[PDB]
Write a protein that binds this ligand. Structure first.
Ligand code: ORO
Ligand code: CL
Length: 311
């Protein structure tokens, strides 16, 4: 009775998709079989811009998108692209993500033609390249692919590197053919997309967050009885802790595979981490405010207040 086609970019093997399958099963049972989610991975329904427009228009009922692709439709959510924003402690990050701060980000979608019903962690990003990236000076003049975010372009600019937005489904080929030197992603994404076949170097950095937003077409959402709306939200929240543990463990598994495949892996040096943060924050925050305006200032303030309380 209430079928929803929900698309996303990732391999079906990864924790987001597995979690969405679990959500689908539980929602179908808890709604007397009436709400049926069908999940389409791997850009099957389009690249993320196409899926986002599809959800807004209602050609598809939903998408799970990284925040990094949503700043055109919703500049406010791009705060989540700022490097080194989240605490290292995952539980404290969750207090931010699931508390007043994250709630304000979900609410910001209402006026923009999406119903954002939940946000899930979905890993932290690491640098890869075909040129050495062992020191901060090494990044100068290199080019990196980013997700479709002006904030992420500024991230790389802050350390003298260039960045261009390329669709995820084209990324393997882009790396293979030297369209860019490098990219950034969680280790298990690097593994499942086989970016180790086309990148020689990896820096374990966790310098920025990959943040998932669960978006429904508003008319679809509104067509659902209230009790089903509540069941869906609660089910996403119920499945979340298992998804995060699967995602954390997948990074460990992925690192072993990446090292075995012959990628040179180094940790981000502490002084390089601090220097990156100090250079990247002003530029990425200014970019965020430039596009989000006063509402972005409001979210920065709310983040600072909640971070101080929590951390
Ligand atoms: O475009 C990407 O890099 C990307 C998208 C996505 O949904 N998940 C991910 O890990 N990376
Ligand atoms: Cl894409």
């Amino acid at each position: 009775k209430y079928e929803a086609r929900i698309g996303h970019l990732e391999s079906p093997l990864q924790p987001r998709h597995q979690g969405l399958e679990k959500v689908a099963k539980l929602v179908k049972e808890r709604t007397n079989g009436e709400v049926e989610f069908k999940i389409f991975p791997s850009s099957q329904l389009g690249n993320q811009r196409q899926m986002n427009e599809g959800v807004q228009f209602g050609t598809i009922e939903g998408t799970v998108s990284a925040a990094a692709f949503l700043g055109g439709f919703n500049p406010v959510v791009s705060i989540m692209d700022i490097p080194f924003l989240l605490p290292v402690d995952r539980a404290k990050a969750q207090e931010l993500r699931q508390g007043k701060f994250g709630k304000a980000l979900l609410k910001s979608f209402d006026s923009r033609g999406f119903k954002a019903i939940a946000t899930w962690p979905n890993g932290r990003k690491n640098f890869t390249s075909n040129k050495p990236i062992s020191t901060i000076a090494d990044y100068k003049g290199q080019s990196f692919r980013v997700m479709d975010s002006k904030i992420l372009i500024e991230q790389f600019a802050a350390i003298g590197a260039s960045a261009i937005a390329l669709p995820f489904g084209e990324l393997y080929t882009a790396l293979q053919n030297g369209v860019v030197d490098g990219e950034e992603n969680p280790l298990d994404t690097i593994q499942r997309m086989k970016f180790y076949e086309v990148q020689k170097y990896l820096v374990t950095s966790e310098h920025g967050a990959m943040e998932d937003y669960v978006l429904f077409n508003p008319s679809y959402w509104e067509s659902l009885p209230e009790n089903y709306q509540k069941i869906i939200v609660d089910t996403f929240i119920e499945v979340m802790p298992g998804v995060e543990a699967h995602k954390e463990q997948a990074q460990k598994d992925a690192l072993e595979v990446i090292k075995k495949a012959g990628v040179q892996v180094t940790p981000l040096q502490a002084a390089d981490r601090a220097a990156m943060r100090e250079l990247m924050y002003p530029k990425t925050k200014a970019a965020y405010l430039a596009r989000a305006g006063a509402q972005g200032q409001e979210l920065i303030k709310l983040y600072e207040e909640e971070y101080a309380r929590i951390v």
